[model samples]
Target chain A: MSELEKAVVALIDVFHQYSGREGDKHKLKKSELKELINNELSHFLEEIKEQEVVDKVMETLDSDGDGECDFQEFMAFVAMITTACHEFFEHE
Target chain B: MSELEKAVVALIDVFHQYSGREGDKHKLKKSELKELINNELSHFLEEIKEQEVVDKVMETLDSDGDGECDFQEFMAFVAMITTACHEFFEHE
Candidate 1:
């Protein structure tokens, strides 16, 4: 895999590790994940604030639309945000 | 000092240590800080998306509104976000 791809995978691993969740099928509630982000990783989450982005992420990941985000869903969310931040910084 | 104060002070220390800047008077330009954040702390910046949050922070810290953020302003920004995160997570 490419460096960016590897970085992305590493990030997913970091998230799962910090979250203390097993496998790629375990679903995390929005509140649970939000709490984790706020409490454990406050330095990170302080940057993003657009609610629409969150909804878009939820829609993209939660294909089943059951309100819970699974591992794949969470990974996808990370990819989306990382992509956005990369693009913003890449801008002149 | 209170727990939160200690936490905020420690966070400031972390920022300066990671940024490799001495003292608390050094100002970080937007582009430079963005670069540091993207390359070193990408995961953290991806969460906050509101431009207003950034602007509010800049304004709060940049008392002179000179368009640059000094260490004090930067610390204030961190405190603001940390406070917000704490409130959000503390909510039932």
Candidate 2:
């Protein structure tokens, strides 16, 4: 696969790896999402030092009010972060 | 960086590599976006054989009606494809 395709797969793969660790294998529960951000996104995002941080993130991404983050919601979060920090990846 | 973080960087990196090839340095023109998809996302997305197809994509992704795709708009497209094909990335 091309780099872009591989990257796309990587995003989905990371989510499932975390989401399947607990309840609702298809969705990420609060704890699953917290662990994902702290562990997987530590470089791009700050470590979740408080439960409130996780809670707020969950509330924002859980647009369907499911309390769990589905793949669509997860992708939206990824998009938001990538868009926010896109400049960092560009050449000087 | 973790796998997920690397993936995020890859997404941004790929966009810039193409977006900077011509025209605006930060946004992707229609031809740039077409080359990006055909070359980078060929494995995950179909090749652009028609200018009409490219035009349609540009219309959709150029949400700001700027006739060019910025990072935010590109991410939205990636999020859409990733969300749609997310299940394919899962273990059977």
Candidate 3:
């Protein structure tokens, strides 16, 4: 496999290790998610700016106020931003 | 070389191919940069939103008004954004 592929796989593996659960799939608390991202995916997450924006996004998505995100909620957030980015390039 | 290393090297090589120059260093025009990025770095660039923001950024950096960016200018813009991202993570 290519290095990029390896990196991506490693990233996903790390994500799974931290938050993946049977049935629950993406059960991750905010603190756990943040810690995993900060520790394991440091390089990639370093590319994001605007912590305030991230915080707001997290809060907005945490519908239950449980201080965590379920798989569906997490995927929703990812899909939203990625779709937004894709739309920006496609529309222009 | 690792897949990640290869990917990064490929990316850098592509950048050099489009913008690197001898002595003058970065001599890529705005249109050239845009085309190269759109064609070659499509995946990466597709992750960014706000074309107007990108256009404004390009204009702001193209101090010569030659409708292109010099090597130093391009580097400056990159360093600025990367640094901003870094700061965001580091500060929080």
Q: Which predicted model would earn the best lDDT?
A: 2
Q: List per-candidate RMSD values in Å.
A: 15.5, 2.1, 13.5
Model 2, A8-84: lDDT tens per residue? 88888898899899988999999999999988988778899898898999999999998999888998899888877
Instruction: State the lDDT of candidate 1 residue by residue for A1-92, as single tens digits.
Output: 32322333344444444445533334655544554455544543452356665565456578678877755455455444433443344331
Give lDDT for model 2.
Answer: 0.88
List where candidate 3 sits over 4 angstroms from the true fold: A1-92, B1-12, B20-26, B35-54
Better of 2 and 3 by TM-score: 2
Tell me the tens digit of each residue's lDDT in model 3 across B1-92: 43322333333444456764333334666555665546654433353356775587578888778767754454444444333433343341
How much of the real interface does each model capture, measured as fnat?
Answer: 0.00, 0.89, 0.03
Residue pairs in candidate 3 whose N, alpha carbon or C atoms collide under 3 angstroms? A2-B3, A3-B3, A3-B4, A4-B3, A4-B4, B26-B71
By DockQ, highest first, what's the ranking? 2, 3, 1
Compared with the true structure, all predictions reach lDDT values of: 0.47, 0.88, 0.49
Going through the candidates in order, their DockQ values are 0.02, 0.83, 0.04
TM-score versus the correct structure, for each prediction:
0.34, 0.92, 0.33
User: Which regions of candidate 2 deviate over 4 angstroms?
Assistant: A89-92, B89-92
Give the CAPRI rating of model 3: incorrect
